[PDB]
Design an enzyme around this catalytic site. Structure first.
Site, PDB file in Angstrom:
ATOM      1  N   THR A 295       0.828  -1.195   0.000  1.00 29.40           N
ATOM      2  CA  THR A 295       0.000   0.000   0.000  1.00 29.40           C
ATOM      3  C   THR A 295       0.860   1.241   0.000  1.00 29.40           C
ATOM      4  O   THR A 295       1.796   1.347   0.784  1.00 29.40           O
ATOM      5  CB  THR A 295      -0.936   0.042   1.219  1.00 29.40           C
ATOM      6  OG1 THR A 295      -1.840  -1.068   1.170  1.00 29.40           O
ATOM      7  CG2 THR A 295      -1.730   1.331   1.240  1.00 29.40           C
TER       8      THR A 295
HETATM    9  C1  LIG Z   1       1.196   9.989   8.915  1.00 25.22           C
HETATM   10  C2  LIG Z   1       1.759   8.637   8.615  1.00 25.22           C
HETATM   11  N1  LIG Z   1       2.903   8.331   8.200  1.00 25.22           N
HETATM   12  C3  LIG Z   1       3.076   6.931   8.026  1.00 25.22           C
HETATM   13  C4  LIG Z   1       4.320   6.246   7.548  1.00 25.22           C
HETATM   14  C5  LIG Z   1       1.862   6.537   8.405  1.00 25.22           C
HETATM   15  C6  LIG Z   1       1.367   5.156   8.459  1.00 25.22           C
HETATM   16  O1  LIG Z   1       2.132   4.255   8.189  1.00 25.22           O
HETATM   17  N2  LIG Z   1       0.079   4.962   8.820  1.00 25.22           N
HETATM   18  C7  LIG Z   1      -0.542   3.690   8.936  1.00 25.22           C
HETATM   19  C8  LIG Z   1      -1.502   3.490   9.927  1.00 25.22           C
HETATM   20  C9  LIG Z   1      -2.129   2.252  10.061  1.00 25.22           C
HETATM   21  C10 LIG Z   1      -1.800   1.206   9.204  1.00 25.22           C
HETATM   22  F1  LIG Z   1      -2.391   0.025   9.325  1.00 25.22           F
HETATM   23  C11 LIG Z   1      -0.850   1.402   8.218  1.00 25.22           C
HETATM   24  C12 LIG Z   1      -0.474   0.292   7.283  1.00 25.22           C
HETATM   25  N3  LIG Z   1      -0.210   0.397   5.890  1.00 25.22           N
HETATM   26  C13 LIG Z   1       0.078  -0.734   5.458  1.00 25.22           C
HETATM   27  N4  LIG Z   1       0.410  -1.070   4.106  1.00 25.22           N
HETATM   28  C14 LIG Z   1       0.692  -2.263   3.805  1.00 25.22           C
HETATM   29  C15 LIG Z   1       0.651  -3.251   4.897  1.00 25.22           C
HETATM   30  C16 LIG Z   1       0.948  -4.695   4.596  1.00 25.22           C
HETATM   31  N5  LIG Z   1       0.138  -5.278   3.696  1.00 25.22           N
HETATM   32  C17 LIG Z   1       0.275  -6.558   3.327  1.00 25.22           C
HETATM   33  C18 LIG Z   1       1.292  -7.331   3.877  1.00 25.22           C
HETATM   34  C19 LIG Z   1       2.147  -6.754   4.813  1.00 25.22           C
HETATM   35  C20 LIG Z   1       1.989  -5.420   5.186  1.00 25.22           C
HETATM   36  C21 LIG Z   1       2.957  -4.828   6.219  1.00 25.22           C
HETATM   37  C22 LIG Z   1       0.325  -2.870   6.143  1.00 25.22           C
HETATM   38  N6  LIG Z   1       0.057  -1.624   6.388  1.00 25.22           N
HETATM   39  N7  LIG Z   1      -0.294  -0.948   7.515  1.00 25.22           N
HETATM   40  C23 LIG Z   1      -0.227   2.636   8.084  1.00 25.22           C
HETATM   41  O2  LIG Z   1       1.029   7.530   8.773  1.00 25.22           O
END
Ligand SMILES: Cc1nc(C)c(C(=O)Nc2ccc(F)c(-c3nc4ncc(-c5ncccc5C)cn4n3)c2)o1
Lengths: 214, 235, 238, 230, 202, 272, 240, 229
Positions: E1
């Site tokens: 994402t």
């Molecule tokens: C202001 C600000 N600055 C930053 C850097 C952020 C931020 O990170 N906020 C945020 C809050 C809640 C979330 F849940 C997430 C979030 N985004 C994701 N993208 C992909 C995957 C994922 N998908 C599939 C497999 C493995 C993974 C790790 C997991 N997440 N979790 C991100 O906010």
């Protein structure tokens, strides 16, 4: 004792121009044995133009089918005999899947039906209800086998050859038969006999296809 | 007077409270609704208590959804809660089934509340009396433009041209004629504004009344501003 | 008369006057006639007539499940309270046993649901009468519920305003119903129904609903569209 | 005055008027009769049809409560249905909690107790139906009667309905010590035809049930060809 | 994402990828990360797709109800507080969602970030997701207030494209939305590889 | 049953609530109590019933909380009651609980106007729900707070309250009204306030040579602070002087009684 | 608990409880609120200065929110129990939406409470009619009026309390659209005084401007009451 | 379930239901109680309905705990409720404070039920007036509660039928420095003066609280004083 269990199986749909080909393998296996080879509890007809095909735990899908069937019946009784559309059924199913979010259903679902302009569309859900509309799609233990094959013959990416004509009912049926005959030979839990449902506008027809019984 | 309860039956079979609440409707402002192949029209007289009120605060025509309007009569104190109920139910039906609710379903959801009156609380809290209001819902769904009516009875009824409120008796007289089935929206405008002109003690002014229209092809609610009503009176 | 103030008061003659009043609510509703055959049941309801250009349309006939159905008379604002309950219960039954609820069990459910409302102070009896129409393993069943809570398994019945003439007609042909076929059943029902309308009014597609439920036939309502097969040719021949 | 409007008001002479008015409504119902014949019980009820289109089997007043016990409700049919459902809830508990068929006298006691919890409160009205409980448990044949007052009493032969005196004068002359059910199903059935007046109700029909050894001590409806024609 | 949105003189710009990976397997390459709540608010989907979809649909029901009752559009500061309360009530039930509500109310454009524990911040530069750490690098060094609408859209597109290229959890189709006073319009929607031969030709 | 419902909480055809009017007419027969708000104290002077020769007093240790007419609600709030006696105790316990829960939550003495509102909402609540009679009692709260100094409120058996500078409730209270509004000035000390009280009290029950068995007085002023243990909370500023509600015995009213009857004979000699 | 139906329909379709509450309103102290161009003013009858009420001031126009003021007419205790509910609602709203409550939403909530009273078991209707004035967060002065029946409505110059129709129909023919800040204070007195006794110490006035609401002091009010009485006596000399 | 109130104010401002209840609470048997610097004396009159009543079992002097006594005059079945709640409130105090409850708090607690029934829904006021007596850390006490809920700290009182004359006699034969046996004698003497026949050890029942405890007098102890007056 855990209240969950995976009864294998697989399903796969391809939406066309004015039809959808739904397919589910009729095979039910328990812990280590093989319960049945004539399991027809995968593809459940909600409305004359809508089906739900689900995999995973068998009790959970036998429960979710009844919940969806009763919600459809309420919608039909409140709206003066108006059978809901595929879009409404798909959104309803997402809402239903998310309500049991903390003790979830162990199913992976597809709501396959026809849209209003006649075009056929498929939906795909996660365990909690992340729906996404799309034109084909497979779920189950044989997902990572069938999905990349369809990705390569339908989207026709990575081939410097002008796009072929639009695939009809017979051609799509043959392609899906290929995919299932190929997945029945490399997955241990898949394939004793598959059932195809050709949903068109003048009703639906149904066919069977026999695989290896090993 | 409290001799007979809230649930007693009259010797003629009709419940006393609902028979009295229907009588309170003819004390209110009149209202109309005309269904046509092009759309539906809802007209009403605000009947302001004084020339000082900012009249846009006593709108007798409330929007329940982008395609469902509702005009009421009787005591406008209750009708607001019926409208909030219809709005919540319509938004739920859009959130769950992802499509506009059907007008008949909104009317069902309204009567479903309007019936829940009684006195013994016990498990669920009830209304101590029926609503002294007769709604009038109009809308456009796939079944074409539709006009439904609701009484304090909890009895919903689909119509083609109805009048509620005080001067509805002569309004039905004006209805029996001057109304074919396949009129034009402009014809409905003329007829409704004429009816309002006929059955009101005040003088019909573009700020005096309120008219809303829901057109079939557009499929949206379009409340009229005074100038548009002046454009209709000038015809 | 001070012995009708409550539903929980017995007159010195052992009468419940609130229920005898609720019966007057049924005796003043729109007339309906049910006729039970050997393999089919036919309900015929007389809705409200259009005022020369305009059509008021109210739902009197309901479908409860694939094999059941009901035509109410009296206060509809109670008929819906009962139809919601009947639908909920036939669904709770089809969910457990995966088969249609038998009529002999549903009639008793309606009876109990009625009776529960004629014995407490903060309640009131449903001023609505039902005509249940069903088909199950044992064949077609036609019941009729009253406000007092009774249920009567009928062969042919009629209720509503001026339904006495409908019954006077039915009590001549009700011996041959087990043999007349579907068209003949719907014709008997329509002839009995048209015998309860006003003087200068006759039956036509605008003011008649015809519901049918039988052995191989799920419950089908019939309005203006396909009523013409049974309605467009029809004369009240005396 | 107002001393006869609610069930929680003793008259000046200590009478609960509402229950007397309730019993007055049972005194005007269809005839019923019953006999405890030392090897079984036989109940027989009159069904007064108001309509000649009524299917046979409608408005049957004799309801089974357990395998061996049955209830004939003379009086208001809807209230009798409530009492029958309560007796069914009482008989299923003893078959569930206590792994035993409910003894007849206990069932009659419970049905009376339930009928009496409606004649103490200001917010209820007394049941307008008298029950005849016919049971055959491991304690022999038992025939009890419960009045809207909530009072139970065991009989050898009991009569209820509009014609209650002349129909009771018939039961005095039966023997009840040598009387067998096989002949009682004829005797009582003929008694009802003798007591039944036919210039008031043009439609009437007799429905009889029994529980003795021949029916495997089970409360069933009589075989159709066992009631005399008239 | 990978999801980003930045504010400038001319509105707000949102940009997203379109891939949803279930661990190491790619479920789909066409997920729609920007959930248009209404004709005036934009919410983005990051984290649990089920949770984000459901709660932003609830928020789009509540904004519409607000508009119906009072007769005026809801503001971003209040449309964002609804979601913060919704999320904070379930802070101990294991939600996983971080969304960005971007709108143009009667106080100019506003852009809030609402987390899965109730966090609610208001800044003019956000990029949430797993490839977010690759957006900031190319976002912080080119971002300035006075960007032309096309120059800022290009900054956002070229910034998502670099997050899709280094991260295994992002990619697919880069889509860019623009939020101005009249509403919002989808600027462009282009495949991630057709961009590669457009930024690094030859 | 619902037929014998008296329906206490209903609007009569003229918007008047009959039960509340009857409660008011009930309070009128109770004992008269007056209260004057001076600048360095506030006094409550009431009349208690004729002492039967066999009455006894509960030998209560520390007799400064409850007299026969006046009670203590908190360290700085005293009250006097008029009306049905045994009903006043329920509200008195409720008010004590309220003025203690605020001190549990905020650790500050509750101001008179907050409590006076929190126990009038209760008196109103019964006038609108429940369908049972209203509390037929009236109060006079006196007390001190840093917001407005010595206050004095008055309550109706309907929930409405009002701040008074010198008020009177009970028998002949329309008389004490015309008499208190006659003679009351801002520049009136505490001891001159008490003189105004007894003087107008005797006039309301018609006694020359005021008696000491039929009268009860309770004064509310500020005394110098007492238990200031600064060494146990070195960051807690204790005020130099704290208010103390105190009920007058026989030994200390008789000096104030002999001057009241003396003022009586003074203003009586000059009648010719 | 006790939930017997109290407000039930009469044999003519009239809610006797609601009419009886609206009668208890007519026996209260008046309250005249007028709407100006950039400020809204509210005047209250302030029953009397009985030479016995505490010299300390107590107000009769209650601050429901930092920008929304209220003035009731009717029974005093129910008025206070309604003001407390409104103050709780404003602070719950500016906790679930971070945005200050508009005037109109508060009027709608208060009218909802008023109406819910007339359709609940065991509760009689509130005997209060209130005038609610205030500013939104973008200026826009609003003035609303509720009834014991629960029917709220926005006005331009409203009066409540005794002799209601007299004051309304008098000052409707003497209200000029878009008055100035010192016009309103003159138009509020000149209309209210048509019902109050000539005593100048039974009037309590409030002016309310954007982000500023201040009460008019005694001499400030006298400066205007003398001008008002002179204009009235001039109108009288013009009558004759 | 009859949640409305039975007692309501009247145009004259009288809870007239309470007046009926206070008349009903003055028709029972005559009880009386006196105080002395050494203790309190309670004396009732067990009016036997018939010679077949087993005078041993009927009782009108109820112990509330090791230090409190009681006696009523009115409806006995009503007084059972107040006695049963009073003993519970006396035990809950020893449970939480570990101290014999003082009399004043006990009366405030049981005078709070009189008032709770004169203002509840669907109940009628009680019809019995108590005579509480006993010891605490600050001396001896004798209170007399009423159906309206009020309570008074008497020194010598009498309730029931024949109260206006019993209290008149008590006015004259009381003395501020009475010892305890004087009190027993005067109680028995003013009961005899109003007794319809001659009292026996099983026609009356007295209880005298002495220095820590209530101790209902036995039949022989009560006799030892009866044949000495
Ligand atoms: C202001 C600000 N600055 C930053 C850097 C952020 C931020 O990170 N906020 C945020 C809050 C809640 C979330 F849940 C997430 C979030 N985004 C994701 N993208 C992909 C995957 C994922 N998908 C599939 C497999 C493995 C993974 C790790 C997991 N997440 N979790 C991100 O906010």
């Amino acid at each position: 004792w855990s209240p969950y269990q995976d009864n294998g199986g697989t399903t796969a749909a391809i939406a066309g121009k004015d039809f959808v080909i739904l397919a589910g393998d009729t095979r039910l296996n328990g812990d280590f044995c093989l319960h049945s080879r004539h399991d027809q509890s995968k593809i459940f007809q909600l409305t004359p133009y809508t089906y739900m095909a689900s995999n995973g735990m068998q009790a959970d899908r036998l429960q979710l089918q009844q919940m969806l069937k009763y919600r459809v019946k309420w919608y039909k009784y409140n709206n003066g005999g108006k059978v809901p559309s595929t879009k409404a059924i798909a959104q309803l199913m997402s809402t239903m899947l998310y309500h049991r979010r903390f003790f979830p259903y162990y199913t992976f679902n597809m709501v396959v039906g026809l849209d209003e302009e006649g075009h056929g569309v498929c939906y795909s859900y996660d365990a909690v209800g992340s729906t996404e509309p799309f034109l084909y799609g497979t779920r189950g233990s044989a997902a990572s086998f069938v999905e990349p094959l369809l990705d390569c013959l339908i989207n026709r990416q990575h081939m410097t050859s002008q796009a072929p004509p639009e695939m009809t009912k017979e051609e799509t049926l043959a392609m899906l038969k290929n995919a299932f005959t190929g997945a029945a030979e490399r997955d241990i839990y898949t394939g004793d006999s598959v059932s195809f449902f050709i949903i068109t506008k003048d009703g639906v027809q149904q066919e069977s296809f026999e695989l290896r019984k090993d | 007077e409290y001799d007979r309860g809230v649930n007693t039956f009259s010797p003629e079979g009709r419940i006393f409270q609902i028979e009295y609440a229907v009588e309170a409707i003819k004390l209110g402002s009149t209202s109309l609704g005309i269904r046509t192949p092009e759309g539906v029209v809802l007209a009403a007289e605000k009947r302001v208590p004084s020339t000082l009120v900012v009249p846009s605060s006593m709108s007798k025509i409330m929007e329940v959804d982008s395609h469902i309007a509702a005009v009421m009569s009787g005591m406008v104190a209750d009708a607001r809660i019926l409208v909030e109920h219809a709005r919540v139910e319509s938004q739920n039906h859009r959130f769950t089934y992802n499509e506009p609710m059907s007008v008949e379903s909104c009317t069902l959801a309204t009567c479903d509340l309007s019936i829940q009156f009684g006195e013994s609380g016990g498990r669920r809290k009830l209304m101590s009396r029926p609503f002294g209001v007769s709604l009038l819902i109009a809308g456009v769904d796939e079944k074409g433009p539709q006009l439904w009516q609701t009484d304090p009875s909890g009895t919903h009824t689909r119509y083609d041209a109805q009048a509620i409120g005080g001067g509805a008796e002569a309004a039905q007289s004006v209805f029996t004629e001057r109304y074919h089935r396949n009129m034009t929206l402009e014809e409905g405008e003329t007829l409704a504004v004429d009816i309002l002109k006929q059955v009101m003690e005040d003088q019909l002014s573009p700020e005096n009344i309120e008219v809303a229209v829901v057109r079939a092809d557009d499929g949206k609610l379009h409340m009229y501003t005074p100038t548009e009503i002046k454009a209709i009176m000038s015809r | 008369n001070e012995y009708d103030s409550d539903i929980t008061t017995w007159s010195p003659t052992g009468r419940l006057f609130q229920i005898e009043y609720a019966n007057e609510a049924v005796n003043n509703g729109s007339a309906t006639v049910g006729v039970k055959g050997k393999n089919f049941v036919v309900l015929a309801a007389l809705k409200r007539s259009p005022v020369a250009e305009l059509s008021s349309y109210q739902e009197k006939v309901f479908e409860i499940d694939e094999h059941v159905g009901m035509s109410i008379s009296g206060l509809v604002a109670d008929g819906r309270v009962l139809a919601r309950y009947l639908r909920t219960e036939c669904m709770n039954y089809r969910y457990m046993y995966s088969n249609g609820m038998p009529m002999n069990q549903m009639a008793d459910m309606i009876g109990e649901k009625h009776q529960r409302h004629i014995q407490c102070s903060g309640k009131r009896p449903f001023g609505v009468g039902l005509l249940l129409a069903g088909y199950d393993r044992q064949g077609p069943h036609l019941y009729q519920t009253v406000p007092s809570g009774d249920v009567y398994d009928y062969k042919a019945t009629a209720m509503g305003v001026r339904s006495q003439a409908s019954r006077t007609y039915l009590e001549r042909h009700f011996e041959h119903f087990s043999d007349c076929t579907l068209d003949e059943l719907v014709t008997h029902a329509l002839k009995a129904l048209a015998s309860a309308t006003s003087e200068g009014i006759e039956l036509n597609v605008k003011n008649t609903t015809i519901a049918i439920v039988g052995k191989d036939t799920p419950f089908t309502i019939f309005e203006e569209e396909s009523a013409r097969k049974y309605l467009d040719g029809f004369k009240m021949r005396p | 005055s107002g001393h006869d409007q609610s069930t929680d008001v003793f008259s000046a002479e200590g009478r609960v008027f509402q229950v007397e008015y309730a019993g007055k409504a049972v005194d005007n119902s269809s005839t019923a009769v019953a006999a405890c014949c030392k090897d079984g019980v036989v109940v027989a009820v009159e069904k007064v049809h108001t309509s000649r289109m009524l299917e046979k089997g409608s408005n049957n007043r004799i309801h089974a409560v357990d395998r061996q016990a049955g209830i004939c409700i003379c009086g208001l049919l809807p209230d009798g249905r409530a009492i029958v459902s309560r007796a069914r809830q009482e008989a299923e508990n003893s078959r569930d909690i206590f792994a035993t068929p409910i003894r007849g006298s206990v069932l009659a006691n419970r049905v009376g107790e339930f009928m009496h919890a409606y004649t103490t409160h200001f917010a209820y009205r007394p049941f307008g139906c008298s029950a005849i409980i016919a049971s055959y448990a491991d304690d022999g044949p038992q025939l009890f009667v419960s009045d809207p007052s909530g009072t139970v009493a065991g009989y050898y032969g009991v009569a209820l309905g509009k014609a209650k005196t002349v129909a009771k004068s018939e039961l005095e002359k039966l023997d009840f010590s040598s009387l067998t059910c096989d002949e009682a199903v004829g005797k009582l059935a003929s008694i009802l035809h003798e007591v039944h007046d036919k210039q008031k109700d043009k439609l009437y029909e007799v429905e009889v049930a029994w529980v003795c050894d021949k029916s495997d001590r089970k409360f069933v409806h009589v075989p159709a060809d066992m009631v005399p024609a008239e | 994402t990978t999801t980003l949105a930045f504010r400038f003189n001319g509105g707000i710009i949102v940009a997203v990828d379109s891939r949803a990976s279930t661990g190491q397997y790619i479920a789909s390459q066409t997920v729609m990360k920007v959930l248009e709540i209404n004709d005036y608010l934009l919410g983005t989907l990051a984290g649990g797709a089920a949770d984000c979809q459901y709660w932003e649909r609830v928020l789009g029901m509540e904004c519409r109800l607000w508009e119906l009752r009072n007769g005026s559009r809801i503001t971003v500061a209040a449309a964002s507080k609804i979601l913060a309360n919704i999320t904070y009530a379930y802070r101990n039930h294991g939600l996983s969602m971080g969304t960005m509500v971007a709108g143009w109310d009667q106080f100019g454009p506003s852009l809030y970030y609402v987390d899965d524990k109730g966090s609610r911040v208001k800044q003019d530069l956000f990029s949430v997701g797993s490839g977010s750490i690759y957006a900031y690098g190319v976002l912080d060094t080119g971002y300035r207030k006075d960007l032309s609408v096309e120059d800022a859209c290009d900054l956002a597109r070229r910034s998502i494209f670099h997050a899709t290229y280094r991260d295994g959890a992002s990619g697919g189709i880069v889509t860019v939305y623009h939020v101005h006073e009249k509403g919002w319009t989808k600027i462009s929607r282009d495949d991630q590889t057709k961009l590669y031969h457009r930024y690094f030709p030859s | 049953s619902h037929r014998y419902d008296s329906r206490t909480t209903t609007f009569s055809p003229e918007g008047r609530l009959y039960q509340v009017e009857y409660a008011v007419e009930a309070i009128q027969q109770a004992g008269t109590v007056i209260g004057v708000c001076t600048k360095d104290g506030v006094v409550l002077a009431g009349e208690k019933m004729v002492p039967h020769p066999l009455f006894d007093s509960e030998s209560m240790q520390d007799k400064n909380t409850s007299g026969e007419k006046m009670y203590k609600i908190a360290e700085h709030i005293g009250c006097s009651v008029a009306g049905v006696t045994s009903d006043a105790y329920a509200l008195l316990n409720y008010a004590r609980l309220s003025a203690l829960r605020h001190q549990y939550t905020f650790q500050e003495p509750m101001a008179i106007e907050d409590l006076c509102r929190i126990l009038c909402d209760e008196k109103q609540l019964y006038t609108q729900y429940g369908g049972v009679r209203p509390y037929g009692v009236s109060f006079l709260l006196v007390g001190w707070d840093r917001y407005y100094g010595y206050q004095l409120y008055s309550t109706e058996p309907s929930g409405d309250y009002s701040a008074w500078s010198a008020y009177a409730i009970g028998q002949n209270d329309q008389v004490a009204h015309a008499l208190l509004k006659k003679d009351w000035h801002e520049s009136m000390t505490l001891e001159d306030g008490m003189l105004l009280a007894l003087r107008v009290l005797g006039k309301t029950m018609d006694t020359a040579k005021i008696d000491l068995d039929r009268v009860e007085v309770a004064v509310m002023r500020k005394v110098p602070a007492s238990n200031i243990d600064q060494l146990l909370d070195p960051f807690k500023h204790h005020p130099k002087t704290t208010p103390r509600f105190q009920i007058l015995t026989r030994s200390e009213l008789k000096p104030h009684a002999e001057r009241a009857d003396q003022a009586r004979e003074a203003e009586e000699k000059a009648e010719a | 608990s006790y939930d017997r139906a109290i407000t039930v329909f009469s044999p003519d379709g009239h809610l006797f409880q609601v009419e009886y509450a609206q009668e208890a309103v007519k026996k209260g102290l008046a309250a005249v609120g007028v709407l100006g161009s950039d400020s809204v003013v509210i005047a209250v009858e302030k029953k009397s200065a009985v030479k016995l009420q505490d010299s300390r001031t107590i107000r009769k126009i209650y601050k429901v929110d930092a920008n929304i003021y209220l003035a009731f007419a009717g029974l005093s205790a129910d008025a206070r129990v309604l003001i407390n509910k409104a103050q709780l609602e404003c602070q719950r709203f500016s906790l679930n939406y971070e945005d200050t409550m508009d005037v109109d939403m508060l009027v709608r909530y208060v009218a909802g409470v008023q109406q819910k009273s007339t359709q609940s078991g065991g509760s009689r209707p509130f005997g209060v009619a209130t005038v609610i004035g205030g500013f939104n967060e973008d200026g826009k002065p609003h003035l609303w009026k509720t009834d014991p029946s629960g029917m709220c409505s926005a006005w331009r110059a409203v009066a409540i309390g005794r002799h209601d129709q007299t004051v309304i129909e008098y000052m409707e023919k003497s209200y000029k659209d878009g008055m100035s800040r010192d016009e309103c204070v003159h138009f509020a007195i000149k209309s209210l005084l048509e019902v109050v006794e000539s005593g100048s110490r039974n009037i309590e006035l409030l002016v309310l401007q954007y982000k500023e609401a201040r009460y008019l002091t005694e001499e400030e009010l006298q400066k205007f009451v003398v001008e008002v009485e002179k204009e009235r006596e001039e109108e009288a000399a013009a009558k004759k | 379930e009859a949640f409305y109130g039975l007692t309501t104010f009247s145009p004259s401002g009288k809870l007239i239901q309470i007046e009926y209840a206070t008349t009903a609470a003055g028709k029972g048997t005559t009880a009386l109680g006196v105080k002395a610097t050494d203790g309190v004396v309670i004396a009732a009159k067990k009016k036997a309905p018939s010679t077949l009543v087993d005078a041993s079992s009927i009782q009108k002097v109820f112990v509330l705990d090791e230090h409190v006594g009681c006696t009523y005059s009115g409806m006995g079945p009503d007084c059972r409720v107040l006695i049963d709640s009073a003993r519970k409130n006396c035990q809950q105090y020893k449970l939480m404070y570990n101290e014999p409850i003082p009399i004043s708090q006990l009366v405030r607690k049981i005078s709070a039920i009189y008032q709770e029934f004169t203002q509840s829904g669907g109940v009628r006021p009680f019809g019995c007036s108590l005579l509480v007596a006993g010891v605490d850390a600050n001396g001896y006490h004798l209170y007399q509660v009423d159906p309206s809920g009020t309570f008074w700290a008497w020194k010598a009182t009498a309730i029931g039928t024949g109260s206006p004359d019993a209290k008149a006699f008590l006015e004259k034969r009381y003395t501020v420095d009475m010892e305890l046996e004087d009190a027993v004698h005067t109680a028995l003497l003013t009961l005899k003066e109003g007794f319809d026949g001659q009292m026996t050890s099983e026609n009356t029942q007295v209880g005298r609280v002495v220095e820590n405890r209530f101790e209902i007098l036995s039949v022989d102890q009560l006799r030892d004083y009866l044949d000495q007056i």
